[PDB]
Design a protein around this ligand. Structure first.
Ligand SMILES: [Ca+2]
Ligand SMILES: [Ca+2]
Ligand SMILES: [Ca+2]
Lengths: 533, 533, 533
């Protein structure tokens, strides 16, 4: 019935929410704007994007945010007639500190205009809101320990949230320290039968990842741990195509069934490599998957052992499928950018990105370079398949090497490749390749660049991704294409390749314009094509 | 008569400006807020702070800015009855790119309300506005080349500025590539006798720094180089107490005398070390110095070789000294903080830094860690002498290790030391030392932290700097002091120690409060003392 | 009945050999001289050193050998009335190459003058000699692939050795490529029932280490792999005190029982640390353990699951205990140094190390520094316990800072600590601490070294090791002891801490003398004590 992952490409930190017979997953968006994606389903198999809640600077201001900063795992719940969304803005992602803030916004409907944030606390990420039977509300999050002699993951902190006062009240208490896996995060609370169940993520979001669960009769513990913990992990299953299984959330359907959504990474093919030495590279980042649960002696169990199954049986409901929500060839005739497109850190106004200046075109006025955490004229969508083609057609007339426009495959400010139009003193208007690998830049077509003929209005730019490797090609007519003589490697656009380990996103493909002279020179993109192959 | 440096501690990129018999110097402030510091003098010997122009968000918004980003060398000039101030907001300081923006603001007076900014260009830093004899206006700045096979310093660009239209007009053109020293920056135009003189900086701002001068009868050149170039350098003079002499600007006095202001580094004592292996560590960063000029066959010459003299002869005017503009022991008696105090990146509002919550105290509401480029509750002043004592007295009751308050010696987010009050599970409220060295944190007193007794209202914190080393000490009563058994080295808070090369500021000393839990806990500082020794 | 590890401290690559009811284990010695240790047992429980075969330069010349080069896993067998020992001299241990040569030496008795080496091949380390029932002899070893785009572990090469001709004959052929674990290493061949069994080490000698076994009816393959492979591994057992379980060799007893000897690492205690993030630091290096086997459908199985047991049941033989073979307090009254003492790389003559010069003393004439891979006057023994005291008493009169003598805890040339006597210009003869971490040297008592009175003939030096930490102490009278106030960490002398990953030995403790001036100055050591707890 259901083949995993249900949300492919960059979809980490899934939070699942039942409202009667409708089902929602919110996922993390990190430095990508707007913040948070929410998908809806009737059958837990087919999913459509229904909301992008954090779209006002008053809710989310990420200017200058570090790569993999911003919106970490969000938490979606529904109570007292409305949806409650908890989210982070993480400012510091390397070193002894992890400075970041937790906020609450609400809405009566999933896709309405959500409130402005209520500040909660800053003590650690992965905040979650629990709505207890007695009407009381409680916030759980991880508690961060910066000290040199200590492990940073101090445990799970709980504090009561007063709806009326719009603040946490009483005193914060640590209710759980974790198991020896440590790196205890992603807390979620569930009242099931006579117990409070505390779900956590442990072992860290790489290959040691796990979901741990514990129970207590008191909300403040002590929590006894599942006798066969972890509840879920891929660590002991180095051949399982789904790796890094953890950061889960429990759903109890109206049909009286139990399911567990979680993140996972799907490494590239590794045949010929030591099984255990390095466990793989995931260009699609961390994706969302689902597992069935069954109950024994008051403990849930992942059906089919504690590793993730590639295929599961969905709940006992009618299949409800959805119509495709993007054009394979986006001609840019719409009056609002398709909802699979996102921007870096900030909203781009009409002065930077516009469908109005030239109907049928996305116009990007040139801003800062691909290494800037501030203002980039860059519109991009997720790699969502191992095998795909992406294509654009652009008119751009640069007058200086400081200006560029092109097709970009992008992980972060220091890790990307592009096929771009720029200008050269002797050759004039040119096509080139450019890579950035940990801030180190290469120009592979150095002194060998494609001269673009004066009479050519539109350059056609394409990338063809074939799992491990990909290639850029170009055309001056849309019919006759020419390969550029460089093979690129997808593993360099993956979480696992990044040396900082603040690497929580996934690969994007998009359209970029830079004008480092500040002459407000723009590029006109006639269309954007993305097609699974 | 005049002993260099004239402006001590962090004072780089000096821009001198004459208005009648009044003399102004504008210096760069980088990430420190508010932006730009302007000093006034009557004799060029004695200098007083009179303006801090960039104090509104509309003019300067630096949240998230990299360390040593922001306001690089500024340009101050006077024409048509008003002051003209050109400044940068530099966003990228590492890698192939140096993304940054150039802005103009004006004021009828030096210390009034400066206009909101007019956007100029982004083609490169070190902007300077030239006021030609015909009433036409011209902007010069360096032109940035990002390409792998290229030297970044493409030379000096020039473009006319239209006052009426509030933008640059016509086509920008390179007017000078520089000499073989390269790293051509800090361009300044002067129309003297029959020639346009172009003053630049070359060799980079380290020990190869120079001031280059060229001339032409045509504004657009080509320019011919001084026959005994450079005009000023420290490179050939390893025994000079003033290194890195470059980035100059020229003044013509009302007494028909000529002077050259420039930046300089003052290395710490390095006796018994190889003269040329490593030329030193400057914790006071780049300071401002002044050289006399003489003329020979249409070319200016620095009086006493092209190396910087430690002492010069002032201009033919009566000496005007200024009263001390701060208290050695600042009791926080005003309704405003003393103007030697700055904040990181952003203004701090009363919600973070206030003299109104506890009379005669600076209260700091705890924000993010010392490693955050966003919101730090931190108020600091420059190290301005090699030997000094600094001290503060603070009331603070932390309820968690996520909370701290202390005395901080600080270079950047990743380089600093501190004597701070925090909380410990066993020991309760404690004093500890903490250092950060390229993001790597040490706690020198780990396991032996100072227990602060419950009846102590105030803890006194002191640093005593003695050139190459410094020590922290504490007191519970203000009378009996105890040294902490750790000697710190001042070279670790110096330009030359930082391994990023983007190290353009200097050491500061100040008061910090962090609340990582987000409970809005605060510290009350009764006084802040700074005293030269 | 038998408690693991059976061979404690640095004892890797064990090769077990049965001769009647006599059992022998040979282990690797790498850069430590003489080469190879052979231990004897009657019961497989109690083990005593009986031979150090490679004691002549014709056999083993290792001057300048890199750290963790030289004698890797040896192979010991018995056939046709004599003992056969196969060994390596590995010359290159980092990079694409692993340059090293395999040699064969023989002896009629375990402890006799072994022959001079017969050169065998150079194609890869882990040589092993197999004696087929029909009286033919074949050499197995790993085949090394240096190529950029290739996994370096090509598989197992096999070739017949001609006894008469003193050389290998025929064509070499690959009989096994390995499993997906790769890093296929440590080949041993056995003829059991109708099958040849090929035992290998896979997964590398760190935490993914395994014992792999396969079978064929032909010597040359193909080999079908054990259906529940690995035969032995610690990888899935992160809580097991015995880690890195692998590099096995099989023994069939005279009692018709089956056991497996293997290497193992015991990580230091790491309570509070994430279970899986980093699996530990092993200052005792790789030790020798023993497991029991049983048979099932023509395949051997480790009794107690495929992980290693801490305690096993020994073979049904009468126990034979051995006398302690060293003095807790070695007064140096013997004619030869105790056989638990080794030297680095080369044997030392009476001109360097002598028990004869001063009666009741070991005299070491000072040679080169602790960072020298050539001539060190160094005599050391293994750390063999997590808790121990080691102690010496030394007479030394340095006349220059170039001269030192002391007590050393030593991993390799770039990683060690010492308490040592040297000379200072003002203070004179002093006691100091020195450490070396990846070639980086520190002196934690600089400016506060202990002045040794001129009337003191002997300085007493002690180290007390307590698992994760150790402390040096001293005495002038041998009754009153002063701790030096520095706490050292044992993990810095562990396999796992070393960056090069050529880290194949373990911590030693010993006596050193340097004379960097070449004046042949010496130190007289009165005793050396080593005592568990
Ligand atoms: Ca179109
Ligand atoms: Ca006061
Ligand atoms: Ca003796």
């Amino acid at each position: 019935k259901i083949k995993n992952p249900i949300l492919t490409g960059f979809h980490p930190g899934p939070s699942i929410c039942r409202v009667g017979d409708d089902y929602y997953i919110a996922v993390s968006t990190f430095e990508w704007f707007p913040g948070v994606r929410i998908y809806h389903s009737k059958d837990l198999k087919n999913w459509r994007l229904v909301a992008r809640p954090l779209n006002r600077l008053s809710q989310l201001n990420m200017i200058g945010n570090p790569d993999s900063g911003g919106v970490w795992a969000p938490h979606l719940s529904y109570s007292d007639g409305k949806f409650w969304l908890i989210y982070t803005d993480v400012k510091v992602v390397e070193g002894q500190w992890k400075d970041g803030h937790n906020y609450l916004v609400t809405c009566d409907t999933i896709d309405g205009a959500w409130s402005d944030p209520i500040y909660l606390n800053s003590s650690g990420f992965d905040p979650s809101l629990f709505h207890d039977e007695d009407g009381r509300k409680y916030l759980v999050n991880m508690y961060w320990d910066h000290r040199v002699d200590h492990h940073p993951f101090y445990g799970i902190v709980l504090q009561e949230y007063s709806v009326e006062q719009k603040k946490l009240v009483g005193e914060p208490k640590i209710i759980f320290k974790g198991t020896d896996l440590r790196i205890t995060e992603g807390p979620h609370l569930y009242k099931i039968n006579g117990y409070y169940y505390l779900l956590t993520a442990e072992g860290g979001t790489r290959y040691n990842h796990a979901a741990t669960i514990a129970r207590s009769t008191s909300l403040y513990g002590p929590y006894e741990v599942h006798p066969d913990n972890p509840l879920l992990t891929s660590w002991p299953y180095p051949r399982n195509p789904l790796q890094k299984a953890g950061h889960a959330s429990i759903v109890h359907t109206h049909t009286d069934e139990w399911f567990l959504v979680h993140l996972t990474g799907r490494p590239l093919p590794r045949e010929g490599q030591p099984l255990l030495e390095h466990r793989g590279y995931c260009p699609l980042g961390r994706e969302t998957a689902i597992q069935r649960l069954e109950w024994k002696d008051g403990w849930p169990y992942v059906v089919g052992g504690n590793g993730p199954s590639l295929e599961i049986d969905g709940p006992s409901v009618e299949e409800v499928s959805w119509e495709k929500d993007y054009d394979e060839k986006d001609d840019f005739d719409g009056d609002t950018l398709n909802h699979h497109f996102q921007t870096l850190r900030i909203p781009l106004g009409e002065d930077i990105a516009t469908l109005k200046a030239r109907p049928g075109h996305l116009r990007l006025y040139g801003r800062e370079s691909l290494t800037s955490r501030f203002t980039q004229a860059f519109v991009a969508r997720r790699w969502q398949h191992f095998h795909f083609v992406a294509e654009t057609k652009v008119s751009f007339r640069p007058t200086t090497f400081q200006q560029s426009a092109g097709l970009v495959n992008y992980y972060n400010t220091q890790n990307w490749t592009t096929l771009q139009i720029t200008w050269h003193e002797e050759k004039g208007r040119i096509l080139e390749l450019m890579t950035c690998d940990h801030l180190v830049v290469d120009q592979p077509l150095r002194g060998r660049e494609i001269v673009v003929p004066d009479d050519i209005e539109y350059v056609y730019l394409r990338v063809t991704v074939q799992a491990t490797t990909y290639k850029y090609s170009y055309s001056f007519d849309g019919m006759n294409w020419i390969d550029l003589p460089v093979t690129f490697e997808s593993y360099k656009l993956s979480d696992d390749y990044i040396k900082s380990r603040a690497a929580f996103t996934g690969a994007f493909v998009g359209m970029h314009c830079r004008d480092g002279s500040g002459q407000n020179n723009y590029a006109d993109f006639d269309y954007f094509l993305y097609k699974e192959l």
